[PDB]
Amino acid sequence: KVFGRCELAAAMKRHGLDNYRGYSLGNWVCAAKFESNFNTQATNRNTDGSTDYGILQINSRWWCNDGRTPGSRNLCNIPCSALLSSDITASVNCAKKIVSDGNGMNAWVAWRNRCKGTDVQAWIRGCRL
Numbered sequence: 001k002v003f004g005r006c007e008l009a010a011a012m013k014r015h016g017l018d019n020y021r022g023y024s025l026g027n028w029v030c031a032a033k034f035e036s037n038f039n040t041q042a043t044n045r046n047t048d049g050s051t052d053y054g055i056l057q058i059n060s061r062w063w064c065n066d067g068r069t070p071g072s073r074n075l076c077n078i079p080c081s082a083l084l085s086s087d088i089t090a091s092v093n094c095a096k097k098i099v100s101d102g103n104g105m106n107a108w109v110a111w112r113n114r115c116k117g118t119d120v121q122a123w124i125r126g127c128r129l
């Protein structure tokens, strides 16, 4: 499913992401935009052999099990395919664990390079929240 900007904002808010760990909603929407272009089915393989999954491009080396990443840690205890669902619950629950792991949102390379330090509030402009 390819979410619309405000549609995603609403879903993430509903799932408790607004200001989770001090990160406003605009940060999460900006991250999803640049990580997957709001597409829940997005996947991208990395050089180390791991793969990033879904709306928030969660990596198989640490967070989920895809059965083909030797050394995967599976910290969110879920098959990576669960992160591609049209329902973002699994992705959100796992993201909460990731952002709490010590490096905050820096865990998302696109957030660090394209969202961090920008006016993220613009990402939720005009949305009925």
Ligand SMILES: CC(=O)N[C@@H]1[C@@H](O)[C@H](O[C@@H]2O[C@H](CO)[C@@H](O[C@@H]3O[C@H](CO)[C@@H](O)[C@H](O)[C@H]3NC(C)=O)[C@H](O)[C@H]2NC(C)=O)[C@@H](CO)O[C@H]1O
Pocket: 052, 056, 057, 058, 059, 060, 061, 062, 063, 098, 101, 102, 103, 107, 108
């Ligand atoms: C969204 C996504 O999946 N992002 C991936 C990153 O999570 C990953 O970065 C590495 O993540 C691990 C797990 O959070 C980091 O290890 C943690 O480091 C912190 C502080 O340094 C420490 O407090 C934690 O104990 C430790 N976690 C454990 C359980 O070992 C690790 O530092 C990150 N590596 C780097 C280079 O930032 C990167 C890299 O694989 O991939 C993203 O896709």
